Amino acid sequence: QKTLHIYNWTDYIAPDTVANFEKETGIKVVYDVFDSNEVLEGKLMAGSTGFDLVVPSASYLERQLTAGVFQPLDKSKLPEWKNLDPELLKLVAKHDPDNKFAMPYMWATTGIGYNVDKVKAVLGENAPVDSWDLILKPENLEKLKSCGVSFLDDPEEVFATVLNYLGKDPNSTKADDYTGPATDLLLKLRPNIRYFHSSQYINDLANGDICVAIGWAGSVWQASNRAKEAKNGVNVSFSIPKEGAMAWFDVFAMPADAKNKDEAYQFLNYLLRPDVVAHISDHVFYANANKAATPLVSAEVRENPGIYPPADVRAKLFTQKVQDPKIDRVRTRAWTKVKSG
């Protein structure tokens, strides 16, 4: 008997991906889900997780690669590795030099999800839905306050987003940038933010309970699709703003103590087949990292510039740099101060 234990994000695979794989290979898949980088990272650090494959964000690889939790990927066992987009491989390679440990899986940005109808009512037909001004100017948040404003509970992405908006380095290594100008703007915005949460905005957007959110691209598009399936007339859309946004990448990695390496490699190469990962993108509304798969993705998804951004939008994206622990601790304390007062 052959078995394979996978640990992936919630809502990050198609409903029949595992079943198709099991039909094709005869391998028993045990599939478990998390919904936070810290829950996965806290299992990885305790060791002996029992997982053969896990899906961390690329920025979390650097911290974990120095701890020696993953083992290098045998490229010869992945003949379809050549299907991966080389540009995405280079961006992930900033956290994983020579792409030794991680296979790019899906990627997206952190932008603005919003209720199209609610925003136009409150802010007029010319609401700045293409700008962070929509959610980072107090004058606007005061108007959108009553219809619901939410921010991610993510100090790394929110501070980077605020810094970029103010004209600073999105990955500034200067402590005063976080406690000074970034905290000032966040404190001005705070009284108009209903909550800081990294998943409640999804269903809230879909149901009409909040009208604007800082959120992950594919999760906002899932909320938009949920409202469409529910036939509730709620029109959710998503915006990568003109000032740029953070792009991030989730990757498959193999723990060093994985018991089913052969089966793990079979599943990776399975994912590299163009139709397998195109099918996932169709259902989760995230762009996969496979360049051969792109034309196979449904037109509604691949021609959506908020999922597959064109070259001009990609040029405005920035990525997460791993900060020195000194700056991590400054970020956490300031975030706590922002969320309270």
Numbering used by the authors: 29 to 369
Text lifted from the article:
To gain insight into the evolution and designability of ligand binding and specificity, we analyzed the homologous PBPs, PotF and PotD, which are Escherichia coli putrescine (PUT)-binding protein and spermidine (SPD)-binding protein, respectively. They constitute the first elements of two separate multicomponent uptake systems (PotFGHI and PotABCD) to transport the cationic polyamines PUT and SPD across the cellular membrane. Still, the protein-binding modes differ: PotF shows affinity for PUT and SPD, whereas PotD exclusively binds SPD. Prior to this work, we grafted the seven differences in amino acids from PotD binding pocket onto PotF; this resulted in PotF_SPD, which will be referred to as PotF/D throughout this work to keep naming for mutants more concise.
All prior observations combined led to the following three constructs: the basic double salt bridge reintroduction E39D–Y87S as well as E39D–F88A and E39D–Y87S–F88Y. The removal of this Phe should allow Tyr to flip inside the binding pocket to accommodate PotD-like positioning. We also introduced F88Y in the basic double salt bridge mutant (E39D + Y87S), thereby hijacking a bulky aromatic residue that already points toward the binding pocket to introduce a distal PotD-like Tyr. The highest affinity was measured for the double salt bridge mutant containing the additional F88Y (KD(SPD) ≈ 5.3 μM). To our surprise, all solved structures adopt a PotF/D-like semiclosed conformation. Also, SPD adopts similar positions to the one in PotF/D in all structures. In the highest affinity F88Y mutant, the newly introduced Tyr slightly rotates inside the binding pocket but does not directly interact with the ligand. It is involved in cation–π interactions with R91 and can stack with N65. The second salt bridge residue E184 interacts with D182. Whether all these constructs can completely close in solution remains elusive.
